[PDB]
Amino acid sequence: NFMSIVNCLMQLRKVCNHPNLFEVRPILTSFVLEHCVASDYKDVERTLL
Amino acid sequence: MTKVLDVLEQFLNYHGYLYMRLDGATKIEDRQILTERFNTDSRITVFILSSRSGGLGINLTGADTVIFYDSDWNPAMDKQCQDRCHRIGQTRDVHIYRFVSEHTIESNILKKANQKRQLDNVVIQE
Amino acid sequence: KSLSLIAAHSHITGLGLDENLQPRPTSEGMVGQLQARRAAGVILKMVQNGTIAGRAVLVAGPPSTGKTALAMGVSQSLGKDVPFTAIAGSEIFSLELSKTEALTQAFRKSIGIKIKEETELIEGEVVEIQIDRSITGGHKQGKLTIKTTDMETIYELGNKMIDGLTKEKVLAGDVISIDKASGKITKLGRSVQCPEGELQKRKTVVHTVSLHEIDVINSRTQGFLALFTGDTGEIRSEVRDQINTKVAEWKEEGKAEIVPGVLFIDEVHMLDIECFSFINRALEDEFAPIVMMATNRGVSKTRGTNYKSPHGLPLDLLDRSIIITTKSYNEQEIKTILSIRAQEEEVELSSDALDLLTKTGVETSLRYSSNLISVAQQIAMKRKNNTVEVEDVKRAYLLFLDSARSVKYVQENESQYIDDQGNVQISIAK
Amino acid sequence: MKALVEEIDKKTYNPDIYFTSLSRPVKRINYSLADLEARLYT
Amino acid sequence: VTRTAAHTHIKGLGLDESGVAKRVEGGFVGQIEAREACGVIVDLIKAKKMSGRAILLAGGPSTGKTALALAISQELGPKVPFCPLVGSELYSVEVKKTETLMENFRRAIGLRIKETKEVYEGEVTELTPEDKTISHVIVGLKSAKGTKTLRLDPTIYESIQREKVSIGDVIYIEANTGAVKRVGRSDAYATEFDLETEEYVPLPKGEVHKKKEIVQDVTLHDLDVANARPQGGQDVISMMGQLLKPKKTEITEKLRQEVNKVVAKYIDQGVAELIPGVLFIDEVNMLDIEIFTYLNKALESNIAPVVVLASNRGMTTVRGTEDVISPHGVPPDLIDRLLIVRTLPYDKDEIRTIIERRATVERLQVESSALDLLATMGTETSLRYALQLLAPCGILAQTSNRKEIVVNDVNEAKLLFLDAKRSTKILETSANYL
Ligand SMILES: Nc1ncnc2c1ncn2[C@@H]1O[C@H](COP(=O)(O)OP(=O)(O)O)[C@@H](O)[C@H]1O
Ligand SMILES: Nc1ncnc2c1ncn2[C@@H]1O[C@H](COP(=O)(O)OP(=O)(O)O)[C@@H](O)[C@H]1O
Ligand code: BEF
Ligand SMILES: [Mg+2]
Ligand SMILES: [Mg+2]
């Protein structure tokens, strides 16, 4: 329909002048790894000690 | 769109230009005084407008340049905006610059307008 | 689990044998080498026996003739819960660790210790948790309700477990486990799972730890971190003596048992003479895992010495060891091996293509054909036919060279290539 | 693992008290008048 | 404007959908069979079915071997990890060469992971510590569209207090990693002082708490060393930890096995996707015998990716061996696992086309006579000589203000600069080892 194409081109025009597409620029922080392979051996070390 | 006025204000503040903005959010009383302040001699070099707010019937004459970020359907109202500076109180040549990206929707719009002598564009595709 | 795409020894799993230690002609991806397979089974039963330790067995044979495959099959048939260390000879040459120390660590890594500990714990869905601040009447009052499929009751929290529960956010309705002895909190998920019965139950936890890990743990303030970072750094000998004595007491007390695993060293021929001299002594001590080695070379110069020794090893080490010899594969075995590899790689081969591939493998090498099988498939889906034909095999054969063809071409065109003296010709004319 | 940042409501949260909670379902009611008056008057 | 260094004139193999290599396509001429084999290898790489393949390409100098090795990586796309390497790089003072080789192996294979993060930002309204031990702090983060209070970990409390923030300063805090960073004082206090160094920022847009999805890619070796050693962190404890052991250390196989297990667990849930890569080693003849011996076992690993090798040598002795002679300086017990791709020298027409393309990418114009002279020189001394001499001819044309290369300019370039043959001729007849 006319509304749908109008909205799509409105999004594209929003992009064109500036990245205002909802403009989510990630902060590029590190990963969130939490397994901590060493922690699995904590119980074994404690029992051995 | 008014969502780029704040972006322009931030950019000009970062670049340290003497700017001053007018749009639909600006109060009625301040509008005429701001227009008079800009039209009179001053150190202000950049003046921010809106397509529908003040791009219609103001008599700005101090400026000499017009910059357009975008124009979707522009037979007369964009001509009106660019001629807002080109008034009878102007004594210098008018330079108009249009911002169009490459391989984008605006580029295709301009190409189709040039091919069709800029009569009317309803559907744009490539 | 145990992610892996494809290995040169992926097809072989568990070797193959019978109740009478008679190798089958084809069992679990192993073809041929009947005498070698029977000797490997004898060694495997020796390892499973555990009565005899510190013996050396050598594997010898031509290159690409069932040498690493034998060790892989022995390891697979030995199964889990038994230590097995496989290190190349060049790995021991470390800049931060002495070769003797690296060898000792490798030896200690192959003997595993099982220790059993009995703990009491409670678990189940938690429905109610109440915690109050200190009053003159009571320092801390805390009641929690854990409901299982069979039970739902309330315990009294005496301060310390109140602090433990408040340390991490806990919400009612999730499955958690509480270890009374350790005093730690374990969350098993949300109610995704279901309870089973009594909250408190009797069970024992068994830990498998090698001697090397024990030494590293006892050698530092936080030694278990060096298990992974590899910065152990020449553990002191008195530490090892103390560990040996403590292990002896634990075994005599029944608190632990030893698992005499297997140490496999590949490409032993390039090991230094000092390493062999140290191995001579290390194989004669009490705690010594079985040692198996594989050397391709024969009658060469031992590294670190000028003279040439048979099999690339000193004579005394050979006396300390037992030699197992493998034989060259035959055409009927080569075709079966290639078919098994194709099945492992999920490649369909025509009979004529298989015969041509077997002929090429006999002519040049088995590894060349076992590599050509995969590359021919790319041409196969390039022609969009699932089956591989003779044309695809011939195209792969001409596209990718062999060792003999490359050597012959180099001999013909030695001018273009860089000589040993450094001479080379780049210009075409003159 | 442990959540470093937790949402906390000032008037609701209090470190002093930690509380969490989840044929016809009906609670138990004591119908003894003597018990009720004993609870009320004590 | 643009920089060109012996490459960047190549954009890919330029093969057809049937695998047929065009005579001239994608900055390439000739070597049709080699390009077809490389395309087959590319398809095998994209298959991801089998890991541990090892191929090498042997040819004379200036035969485009490194050009092919760059073209395959270009075809594979930036998504697939590619690890260029030279044989000399394996010799490291800090750690043994075996550890470096295994580290490169782990670097070769990549992994794509997706995760969601929680972000809190706004203007600070109050700092209330909860106080033996460092107490928690209640923060009054306030945005333009909402307001809420949060309790912070004492490590986060130390970090935020190290930022020297106060009331009315807009701060940013990451809920996942605990990162704390203050953008600046809120714009409300801009006029508080007529002269203050601290800059002012507008109030954050949106509510305080935000969530987003990121599909960032991390290699296997990256998380391997993440588990091996501590990394950056705003607290002093992190600085102490990462300063305790600054020197790198070799990683045991136990950590690698645990990493493999956790990666398989991650891929089971569908959060992560595995993308094997290609490791490239140049001047493989420079490696030692022990490196090849360890590589024999390394290739047999189940997770070892596909590695491509390059060498230009005939019957040569393997380094570290006093008598072992084998082609390309690769021991015979290793060449069996390898697939050899031959490479052949070019012809006069191929050299001329190469020079034409090199001039075109260099944005230069060459007359027919100058091009013929350059082709004759390349056929007379070496292909590389014409490519090297191209730029001086352009400089000479610039000096003479002409816009095209003529015979005089290339003749002057020949006079000014000498090739290896002329230099050797001078060396043979010299006064004192000129
Ligand atoms: N009995 C067998 N069954 C199946 N494949 C085998 C067998 N023996 C050897 N192979 C193949 O040979 C390869 C191992 O070569 P190997 O003989 O270990 O080389 P080397 O002798 O240099 O150690 C494996 O990839 C395997 O596919
Ligand atoms: N088919 C080709 N098309 C374009 N340039 C080529 C071609 N073959 C070789 N070259 C050029 O030859 C030079 C040498 O090739 P390269 O493989 O990089 O080093 P070498 O072959 O000397 O080891 C490269 O800089 C490359 O630009
Ligand atoms: F009043 Be007008 F048309 F500017
Ligand atoms: Mg082998
Ligand atoms: Mg090169």
XYZ file of N, CA, C and O and ligand atoms in Angstrom, chain E residues 6-7 9 27-29 61-67 346 354 384, ligand 2:
91
model
N 52.637 -4.339 -4.405
C 52.843 -5.640 -5.038
C 51.574 -6.479 -5.104
O 51.631 -7.653 -5.489
N 50.429 -5.902 -4.757
C 49.159 -6.606 -4.676
C 48.055 -5.563 -4.819
O 48.295 -4.466 -5.337
N 45.897 -5.470 -6.898
C 45.405 -5.637 -8.256
C 44.655 -6.947 -8.427
O 44.153 -7.224 -9.521
N 42.323 -9.800 -12.206
C 43.744 -9.515 -12.076
C 44.619 -10.745 -12.172
O 45.631 -10.841 -11.467
N 44.253 -11.691 -13.032
C 44.987 -12.939 -13.157
C 45.167 -13.292 -14.624
O 44.281 -13.039 -15.445
N 46.317 -13.877 -14.944
C 46.597 -14.398 -16.277
C 47.279 -15.750 -16.126
O 48.173 -15.918 -15.290
N 60.499 -18.714 -8.117
C 60.255 -17.354 -7.627
C 59.422 -16.558 -8.620
O 59.493 -16.769 -9.832
N 58.620 -15.639 -8.082
C 57.759 -14.769 -8.886
C 56.802 -15.576 -9.759
O 56.579 -15.256 -10.928
N 56.231 -16.636 -9.190
C 55.264 -17.471 -9.891
C 53.841 -17.277 -9.384
O 52.948 -18.037 -9.771
N 53.604 -16.284 -8.531
C 52.260 -16.015 -8.061
C 51.756 -16.924 -6.968
O 50.544 -16.987 -6.744
N 52.648 -17.637 -6.277
C 52.217 -18.509 -5.188
C 51.575 -17.705 -4.063
O 50.461 -18.009 -3.621
N 52.267 -16.667 -3.588
C 51.675 -15.797 -2.579
C 50.455 -15.073 -3.127
O 49.516 -14.782 -2.378
N 50.447 -14.781 -4.430
C 49.258 -14.203 -5.043
C 48.072 -15.150 -4.929
O 46.959 -14.725 -4.604
N 55.686 -17.825 -16.476
C 54.830 -17.165 -17.447
C 55.546 -17.022 -18.790
O 56.685 -17.457 -18.971
N 50.451 -8.621 -17.667
C 50.646 -8.299 -16.257
C 51.117 -6.860 -16.107
O 50.627 -6.118 -15.247
N 59.853 -9.295 -11.925
C 59.731 -8.275 -10.889
C 60.428 -6.980 -11.276
O 60.060 -5.911 -10.777
N 48.689 -14.415 -12.637
C 49.205 -13.280 -12.109
N 48.564 -12.099 -12.224
C 49.071 -10.967 -11.702
N 50.236 -10.907 -11.033
C 50.984 -12.019 -10.846
C 50.494 -13.295 -11.386
N 51.408 -14.225 -11.065
C 52.398 -13.602 -10.381
N 52.145 -12.290 -10.245
C 53.025 -11.321 -9.552
O 54.270 -11.951 -9.245
C 54.720 -11.554 -7.949
C 55.351 -12.724 -7.206
O 54.318 -13.608 -6.788
P 54.244 -14.098 -5.260
O 53.633 -15.475 -5.199
O 53.626 -12.965 -4.481
O 55.775 -14.246 -4.776
P 56.732 -15.437 -5.289
O 55.974 -16.075 -6.428
O 57.992 -14.733 -5.724
O 56.903 -16.317 -4.076
C 53.510 -11.020 -7.202
O 53.801 -9.729 -6.666
C 52.404 -10.910 -8.229
O 51.945 -9.558 -8.306
